[PDB]
Enzyme design. Sequence first.
Site, PDB file in Angstrom:
ATOM      1  N   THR A  55      82.474 141.621  93.320  1.00  0.00           N
ATOM      2  CA  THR A  55      82.943 141.359  94.625  1.00  0.00           C
ATOM      3  C   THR A  55      84.245 141.935  95.097  1.00  0.00           C
ATOM      4  OG1 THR A  55      84.588 139.606  94.507  1.00  0.00           O
ATOM      5  CG2 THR A  55      82.237 138.944  94.284  1.00  0.00           C
ATOM      6  N   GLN A  56      84.049 143.357  95.556  1.00  0.00           N
ATOM      7  CA  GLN A  56      85.177 144.384  95.685  1.00  0.00           C
ATOM      8  C   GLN A  56      85.432 144.678  97.152  1.00  0.00           C
ATOM      9  OE1 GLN A  56      84.807 143.407  92.273  1.00  0.00           O
ATOM     10  NE2 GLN A  56      82.914 144.948  92.741  1.00  0.00           N
ATOM     11  N   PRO A 103      85.670 140.673  90.482  1.00  0.00           N
ATOM     12  CA  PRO A 103      86.163 139.243  90.588  1.00  0.00           C
ATOM     13  C   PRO A 103      85.541 138.413  91.676  1.00  0.00           C
ATOM     14  CG  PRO A 103      87.907 141.300  90.651  1.00  0.00           C
ATOM     15  CD  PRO A 103      86.542 141.655  90.869  1.00  0.00           C
TER      16      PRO A 103
END
Lengths: 136, 237, 213, 226, 242, 234, 252, 45, 239, 224
Positions: C1-2, C105
């Site tokens: 999740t960027q 993350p």
Amino acid sequence: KRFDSEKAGDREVQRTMLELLNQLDGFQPNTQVKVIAATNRVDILDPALLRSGRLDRKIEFPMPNEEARARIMQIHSRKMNVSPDVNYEELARCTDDFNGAQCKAVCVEAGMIALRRGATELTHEDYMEGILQYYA
Amino acid sequence: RNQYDNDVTVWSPQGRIHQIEYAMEAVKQGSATVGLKSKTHAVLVALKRAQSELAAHQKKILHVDNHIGISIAGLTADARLLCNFMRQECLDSRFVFDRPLPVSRLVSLIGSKTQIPTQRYGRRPYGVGLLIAGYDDMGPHIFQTCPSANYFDCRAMSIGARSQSARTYLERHMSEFMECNLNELVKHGLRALRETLPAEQDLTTKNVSIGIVGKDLEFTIYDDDDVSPFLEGLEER
Amino acid sequence: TQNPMVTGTSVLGVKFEGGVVIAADMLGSYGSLARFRNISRIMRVNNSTMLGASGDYADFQYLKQVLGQMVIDEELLGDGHSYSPRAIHSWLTRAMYSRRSKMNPLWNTMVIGGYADGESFLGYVDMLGVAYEAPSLATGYGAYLAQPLLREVLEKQPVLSQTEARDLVERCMRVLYYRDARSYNRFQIATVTEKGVEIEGPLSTETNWDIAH
Amino acid sequence: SLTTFSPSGKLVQIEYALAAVAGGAPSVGIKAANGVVLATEKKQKSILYDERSVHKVEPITKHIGLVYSGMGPDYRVLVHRARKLAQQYYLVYQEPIPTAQLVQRVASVMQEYTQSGGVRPFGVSLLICGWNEGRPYLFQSDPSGAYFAWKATAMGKNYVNGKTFLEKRYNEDLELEDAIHTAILTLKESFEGQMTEDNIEVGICNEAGFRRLTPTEVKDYLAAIA
Amino acid sequence: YDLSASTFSPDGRVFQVEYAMKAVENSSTAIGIRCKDGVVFGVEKLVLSKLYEEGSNKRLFNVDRHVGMAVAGLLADARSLADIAREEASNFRSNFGYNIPLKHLADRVAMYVHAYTLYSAVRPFGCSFMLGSYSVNDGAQLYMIDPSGVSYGYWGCAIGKARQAAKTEIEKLQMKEMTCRDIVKEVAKIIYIVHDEVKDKAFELELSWVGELTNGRHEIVPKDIREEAEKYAKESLKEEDE
Amino acid sequence: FDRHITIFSPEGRLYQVEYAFKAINQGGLTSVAVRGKDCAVIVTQKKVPDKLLDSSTVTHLFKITENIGCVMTGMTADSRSQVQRARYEAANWKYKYGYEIPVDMLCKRIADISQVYTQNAEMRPLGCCMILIGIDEEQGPQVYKCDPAGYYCGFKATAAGVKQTESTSFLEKKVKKKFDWTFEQTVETAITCLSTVLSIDFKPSEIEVGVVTVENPKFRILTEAEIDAHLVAL
Amino acid sequence: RYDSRTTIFSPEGRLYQVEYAMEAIGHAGTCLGILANDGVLLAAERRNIHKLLDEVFFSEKIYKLNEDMACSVAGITSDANVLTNELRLIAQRYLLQYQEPIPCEQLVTALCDIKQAYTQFGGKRPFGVSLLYIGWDKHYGFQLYQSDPSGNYGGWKATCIGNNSAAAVSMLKQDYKEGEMTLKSALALAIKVLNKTMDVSKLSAEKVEIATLTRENGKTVIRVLKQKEVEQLIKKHEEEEAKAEREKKEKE
Amino acid sequence: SDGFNGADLRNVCTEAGMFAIRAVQEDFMKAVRKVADSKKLESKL
Amino acid sequence: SYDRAITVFSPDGHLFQVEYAQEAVKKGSTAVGVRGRDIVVLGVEKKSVAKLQDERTVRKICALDDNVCMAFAGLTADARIVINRARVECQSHRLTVEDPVTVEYITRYIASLKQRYTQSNGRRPFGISALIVGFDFDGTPRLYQTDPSGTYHAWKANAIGRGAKSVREFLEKNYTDEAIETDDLTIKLVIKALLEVVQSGGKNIELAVMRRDQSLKILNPEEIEKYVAEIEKEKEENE
Amino acid sequence: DRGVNTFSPEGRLFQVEYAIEAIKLGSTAIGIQTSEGVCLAVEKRITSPLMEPSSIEKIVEIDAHIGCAMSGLIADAKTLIDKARVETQNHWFTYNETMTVESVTQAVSNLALQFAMSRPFGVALLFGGVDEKGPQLFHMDPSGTFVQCDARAIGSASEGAQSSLQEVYHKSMTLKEAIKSSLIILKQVMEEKLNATNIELATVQPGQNFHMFTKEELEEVIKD
């Protein structure tokens, strides 16, 4: 199976078998007869001798459970000069797949074992050794 | 029983599988270990055998987690592998959740594993029988586990050779069980071992290992000297 | 999740003397394009624990499903053992720490509330994995302009009553709505007490602007 | 599983495979001057069977035909992998695979599948034909992965007498029409019952490229030469 | 010969699955009935050793909130399969956001059993089982699965030693139009009557259900309900004796 | 050495494949199928032991895709495995080529898979025979029966099970006279053929009948209403 | 079970598989090779030349592995095919590596190592083929080698394998000098050997296959003798044989 | 119903007469018992 | 791949496979080796070769380095493979450390190879017995031997093959520093041992010798003829 | 029982039993622990003469604080000892310490447990080490059962040497008494006379590290 064609003697057994079949399936009421068969090679047997007018109600003998082993050993010990202290049920538990006459053989061996010294009591562990390194 | 008795992968024409029966036979061949429990205490009293007078007795009580101990009977190799596995599981469970791994969950996982190599044609069972004493949030737990994975949650159980005498004593004194002090708990376990052992043989402070778990006491191992007070106070015949 | 694309806003939590009460809005946003509103960011983890998020709603939902499955597993086990609020806190900390370390993350700032065995739990597992256990939590950008009030109030009065805590959280979120570009006059309060977890529907505070006029 | 060389230097499993192939649907091939003719007994076991679904003669390329005797499924797999190999040949070499390389590779596949443990070698003898170059080629491929070039040949139940018949029949001077006559005559002498036009399948390979003759043409030739 | 799953017996019968059912024919019993508004399970849990405990190893478990199952046979394979169905249900929930239909769940577990009876380096499972579930959108559903992997939707069924007597006493019922409440007492009577005390000595009756009364959630029978059903079963036994 | 999955006997004779055929025959039921001028029909026995079961829960007909029906004859587990594998194949075929797989391709795929099973001495030839019914753009009522040995043969009329042979002979006799049938004629032919080869009168219950028609390219398992309607009508 | 036993030792130290391969080679068709100072040659029997057989491939027991090496195969034809493919692969990889043709001995060593790997790698039967190589290396000029299923290889001046290899090689050793017999006479030597060995005195280009490797223009040349040349070699062989016979009987 | 024998009828009738003595035989629900019995004999072979 | 166990222990506690392998080594040719103060000698039976058979392709003796030389007894392909493995290993050891491989280290490697190939869960244990002779970089006439079972030991001389038994008793007898004083009389002892099996004086005894850190050298056949001639002169003088 | 890893009906894997038979066939070794250290004396199996004593290696060094004796297959001992040395050095690298003898023994046994590997090792080992609890002796068998002993004997004369050890050993001796008694028993059980070349003798003491006795001290003790 009646079809195997190994050799002679076989075919004689098949005539005898067929004679058996005849004797109860032919033009005969055979009212005044009671056939009871006994076998151990349960699987391999003649498909016609099998049943349904010939050998019906094929009672089955299973492996005795713990209770059954306790009962059989009690039966064989009934006449045994057993002292007033027995763990019959726990001996049955120790049996651990002790199905057959082994129970009778063990009661006899226990009699002889006690007779080493002339006694009338159950050690309960010399009884297992009569029954019959690395880790442990 | 000609054929039908090689590898667990072969089904006998009796609904039976015999490699597992052989593993259970090895479990019996193992040495005596009795576990029992009270409202707040689980005691494993185990007989460490003496291979030779110059060889020290084989320890068989292993503290896997603070609140979990095991008494082993059977192949020491498989026992060691399984002990390593439970230690790893306890550490992982503590890591993921800051919790003592529930005894029931742990025993279920171990049963699952020991089942896994019973359905493939490349491996063998684990001829090791374990008595587990744990203390979870629900309190003390006594579990028995065999190679078949048929874990049993027991008020008091016994495994290994001569385990039947321990079974008899435990069955007789269950009513007292769950209603005795910790010292009485250990004394009852010792009485079970005394019944199991040959009459001539007596429990010295060299043949016995006592693993005790319970409230406010992580699983503690008592060997050599720590067993001394219990044996000294124990009744005789 | 960027990628930060679609989140909610700050979340609040208070360790009530007899329980734990948290509040979170029903704003979904895409950068001044407020997404479908009645989404909420709070759910009931178990009979004694509630979850809330202040990050990407998709990730928050993913966490919700995984944790719901886990708790369903525990219930199905039937052993009576129930996940502790701190146990779930640790699990979540480990999860986000691992995701961070592997460079994926989970884009969710956490607010875990719980009340077990007469003990009130309050956790703030953050983005990277930082853990906390304080009587009060103000996660999201609302930390700066909500946690001061909660901190001072707790320090001058450790033990707090249910109604007082509710009024304080309502006032704090009302101030948040006054001074937040991504707030919303519609919020859920989830509270955990010895009796269980209760969510009081989509409440809205009594915001006033003529007070400043 | 196939490594069990008998104490004779022979591989009994491939021996048995050859036996099964011998116990296979009769087929015949005859290479003429301008092309080759392939035929086979397609007799179904009843009129029920849709005699247009299960084909026996298959074009692996616009200029390569393939027929077999033996296992139908093994035949399907082998023809599929032959289509494959030929097709990768086409892709790399933007040109149809010459029959020599195609059969070499098919026999290589046969052998490689022969050369493991969990593998039961195919039970089909194949009769590939091609018109690469201005020359017509016929190759029998053996379950043992052996490829033999031929003039004319027969395989199946009556392959030995088919072979001697073709021996005595063939002459280098022979047009494809007489080749068809010869092949159909061989199938007649090796066939039981009437040759209903659709119970026999045949394919030719010429400058026009390999093509399976329709029921119309096969009926015509049968009704003529009978 | 009848050794491996590869050996198609000349009759065309694979003997290892037959041996698997033979092994299955060793567990006590496991009966279930699909009431019009749910499913009810009973099982004859035989305490092998008096030292065992209640609240112990069970022959019934929960998969998902909305499915239960009861097993009979090799308890190791039983627990393995129960956990299995557990993760298939969980994965379906992850994929589609809702409780898996019992039909599809039984389909997948049956496929798993089918694969482990096909392959060679493995063995078929030594235990059969029954899956019960309820929903409003699909009523109450019941399925049974065997080592061969047969998934058939039964309005009521059983497995184990007294499977035949279970089936007979099941057909002695208007299973179409009774509720879980009375069907539970009926299942208790089933277990008690089929029970062979003369042989099994010790025993205990374990029961559970899932239905609208529980909002389509599988749970053990409450303590009071189970005690009442057991009392009714004992009184029915006395009635039959007299 | 024939005990292995597929190992040639002295003259061939893959005894295990032949045993797979015997397993199919021992499946325990029977099925028949026919293709009309523009409509194809199929019937199959359907028993309900113990009076439980029934419903759609117990059956042997399966909609492989919206336009292809199929029937099974063999060990129920094996048959369902085949059915779902074929469903996977057809779905992938649509996902790849964008058009519904022709019945010919579907049977070809299952045939190749079963052949691989026979081929490698590690996967047993699973004991069941599959039959597919469909409609084609330029073949109308296509019927194709595929077998574990790997044949994918299409019959104007086919049968599977113990009475496959007698049913085949009857179908040959009937088709010898004016194969040009209508829908009602085809359904009557199939039902009467099965009734003749079973020597049993039929209630609408203990059977399953599926149909496909050119006008309606949709496999339809006729309900008890239509089954009984046809039965009583003829 | 059912796994057979390939890479196993006989109770008496032996390998049934290897010996079965040996006897298979022996039953296979006869072949032989001769090394001469001028060049090298190799003769091979054709088991069948059935008239229906076509003549597409230049050779039926021999293959040119490269422009300076060739092999002949006695045994299973497909095994030979795959083996020669492996040989081509190895030699051409060697040429890629070193921008130069591989030595015959090195190529032989590589293939024999592969053979041994097959003989010792689980359940994979060894190839049932025996190979005879004629090549030209810059080190030893012309070279003739023989390789067996066991991986044993030997570089010899001449030898025979296949059917009647024992009698053929015995007579060869009897009637072979060491550094003589150029192609002109080596052809007659081979023809007479095959006439006495094949056990059918009638020899022609149909039943035989002759290959010759010779150096010219500083480059190797491998050529299979045409039917005409084989027939003239036949004729001359029978002529000198009839001569020797008539002088021998005259002496008698 | 499967097999070929009617001796199932004799078995059911005899055992049901035994039942009645323990306690007519309006018990086709009981005849299915001996049907299952004969079918388990079938299972045996 | 194969992943099938082999090399099963026997009821007696032995390995049928290893005993078969060692007898298969025994059945082969015979070869002797000895060590001097600075000379290490290695003779071996040629085993007959057709007049058309090149000896270069009979390499039953291989120089694995400037300090190690192995004489083979078994299957030639196994010899080739094990030799190539050991030599790649020695070059690898040269990479690891800029010193020649010691005979002890090479023998360790060979024994490890044998163990791997006898207990690698499906393999054919190398039916080979190896004899190595080298001079450590400092210089030591070390000679080592390796059985097919993998067990290796330090040897001042050895003799392996069909005649291994008799030649072993012979060498155990009538051996002393008088015999192994120097190159002199050492080749004579070797040739006497090989003629223990008589009548092969000119048909066998292919011989090599390596001086201290100088090089290995095959003994030319004129030299062999001279040595055998003077040896039989010594004999006839004895009788 | 037949098969690769099949469990024998009477328990055990039966390959453990085969390994035990191999160990019994193996040569004889003795180890004794004392508060003053641990001594190892192994009889050798020097073949026909010409054998330097540095040809058969029945003793090995594990760090400067443990010795190990073998009985069984030379290369099996070599592999197991290689593993033990590697594990010991890895632990020293990771700990800035040395393993306990118990821990090294159990690690090696753990490796031995895996039967990749298709057969159990044919070597039994005796590790005499010096660790936190002084000098100790650990006997390890191919099954993997490791136990610390006051005095152990393995090999062909295993049982007789063990009986002699039971007779002679007491809870109180020193390294000198240990070595002299061990040498007496070794001579009494030797294949032939005590030539001072057919034995290997080592000691590890709370003091001097592990040490191989040199020819001088060997002959000294022999004459003693």
